[PDB]
Amino acid sequence: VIDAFRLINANMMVLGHEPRQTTSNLGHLNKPSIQALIHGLNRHYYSITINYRKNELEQKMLLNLHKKSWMEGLTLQDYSEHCKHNESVVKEMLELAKNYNKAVEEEDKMTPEQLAIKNVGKQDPKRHLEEHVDVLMTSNIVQCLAAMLDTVVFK
Amino acid sequence: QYLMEGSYNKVFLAKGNIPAESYTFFIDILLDTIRDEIAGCIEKAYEKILFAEATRILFFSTPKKMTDYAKKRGWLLGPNNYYSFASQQQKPEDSTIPSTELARQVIEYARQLEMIV
């Protein structure tokens, strides 16, 4: 949220002179904070156009994160840890499962507020159980995949 | 059926030579095929073979035929040999010894599993 003002007097707005002076402008209007701001803006010179001088070299600098990605893509943790993750998720999945039975049996309702009370639609077992299978699958794949890759290559 | 079962003793190599119109031609060649089949089954099955043992099972006619068939495969050492036993023992356990065998080539396996879902 940036705006530009040269700032010229009130009369210039009132007459309608101020758009004759601006020519070679597009202009724009936004409202961070209500009618009071709009009025202040109009008195000034309103939003005069901001363009950006940018290109791909500058754009590439901003892109970056970590070259450290080099070590990290290969890294995998201790096997006891692999087991902790798998255990925590299966245990979790048991809790939500009991609601899930109801969900599939019913859910004729399509009205979000009524569904929420009826078949525990809000705190849904479908959303969360799916979300859970998906973390567990991806997590196991990257850890497992790395361990094997490293083995062959280092020796 | 008899071939199918493994019931080699029952198999006719004694019949089909008795009608001589055209049935004999097939049965003579078949005798070589069953003979080979026995040599293979015994190779993986049991560690030794005798000469008292061998004549009857392969359906050899002579002891000379025994000497010939066994050495090819690599058996012959005498009435006592050791092929089978050792290999049968070696297969379970690859938890302390590195491996990738089954579930395909692993490297592909993890990547494929993730594409599908």
Task: Collapse the DSSP code of A37 into the 3-class scheme (helix H, G, I; strand E, B; otherwise coil) and give the result.
Answer: helix
CA angle A79, A130, A133 (to 5 degrees): 15
B110 to A148: CB separation less than 8 angstroms, yes or no: yes
Point out which residues pair with A47 in neighbouring strands: A28
For residues A144 and A151, give the distance between their C-alpha atoms in angstroms, rounded to a whole number.
11
A145 to B111: CB separation less than 8 angstroms, yes or no: yes
Instruction: State the virtual CA torsion across A22, A28, A32, A36 in degrees, nearest 10.
Output: 50
Q: Is B91 in CB contact (< 8 Å) with chain A?
A: no
For residues A127 and A119, give the distance between their C-alpha atoms in angstroms, rounded to a whole number.
13
> In 3D, which of A146, A133, A101 has the Cα closest to residue A120?
A101
CA distances (Å), origin A121, targets A26, A48, A85, A132: 49, 49, 27, 17
- DSSP annotation of A28: B
> In 3D, which of A104, A2, A116 has the Cα closest to residue A51?
A2
Contact B16, B24 (CB under 8 A): yes
Contact B81, B54 (CB under 8 A): no
| Identity of the residue in B106, B113, B114 whose CB atom sits nearest the CB atom of A148 | B106
Residue that the structure tokens 């497992």 belong to: A144
Point out which residues pair with A28 in neighbouring strands: A47
Residue that the structure tokens 């026995």 belong to: B38
**What resolution in Å is listed for this PDB structure?**
11.8
> Experimentally, how was this structure solved?
cryo-EM
Q: Is B94 in CB contact (< 8 Å) with chain A?
A: no
Q: How far is B117 from chain A (nearest CA, A)?
A: 9
Contact B13, B30 (CB under 8 A): yes
Side chain identity at A8, as an amino acid letter? I
Contacts of A76 (CB under 8 A, 6+ apart): A142, A143, A144, A146, A147, A150
Residues in chain A: 155
| Identity of the residue in A138, A151, A152 whose CB atom sits nearest the CB atom of B114 | A138
B110 to A145: CB separation less than 8 angstroms, yes or no: yes
Contacts of A29 (CB under 8 A, 6+ apart): A38, A41, A46, A47
For residues B74 and B91, give the distance between their C-alpha atoms in angstroms, rounded to a whole number.
22
> In 3D, which of A39, A48, A36, A37 has the Cα closest to residue A7?
A48
CA angle A114, A118, A122 (to 5 degrees): 75
Q: How far is B110 from chain A (nearest CA, A)?
A: 6
Please count the other Cβ atoms lying within 10 Å of the Cβ belonging to residue A141: 17
Largest Cα–Cα separation, chain B: 66
**Which ranges constitute the DSSP H helices of chain A?**
10-15, 18-22, 34-44, 56-63, 69-72, 79-105, 112-118, 125-154
For residues A5 and A48, give the distance between their C-alpha atoms in angstroms, rounded to a whole number.
7
Taking contacts as CB-CB distances below 8 angstroms, the residues of chain B near A137 are: 113-114, 117
For residues A136 and A89, give the distance between their C-alpha atoms in angstroms, rounded to a whole number.
7
Residue that the structure tokens 């990257």 belong to: A142
Q: Is B100 in CB contact (< 8 Å) with chain A?
A: yes
For residues B76 and B64, give the distance between their C-alpha atoms in angstroms, rounded to a whole number.
13
Q: Which residues does chain B break after (C to N > 2.5 Å)?
A: none
A137 to B111: CB separation less than 8 angstroms, yes or no: no
> In 3D, which of B55, B54, B58 has the Cα closest to residue B36?
B58
Task: Collapse the DSSP code of B98 into the 3-class scheme (helix H, G, I; strand E, B; otherwise coil) and give the result.
Answer: coil
CA distances (Å), origin B8, targets A22, B47, B56, B67: 106, 20, 11, 21
Side chain identity at A81, as an amino acid letter? E
Left, alpha or beta for A128 (phi > 0: left; psi -120 to 50: alpha)? alpha
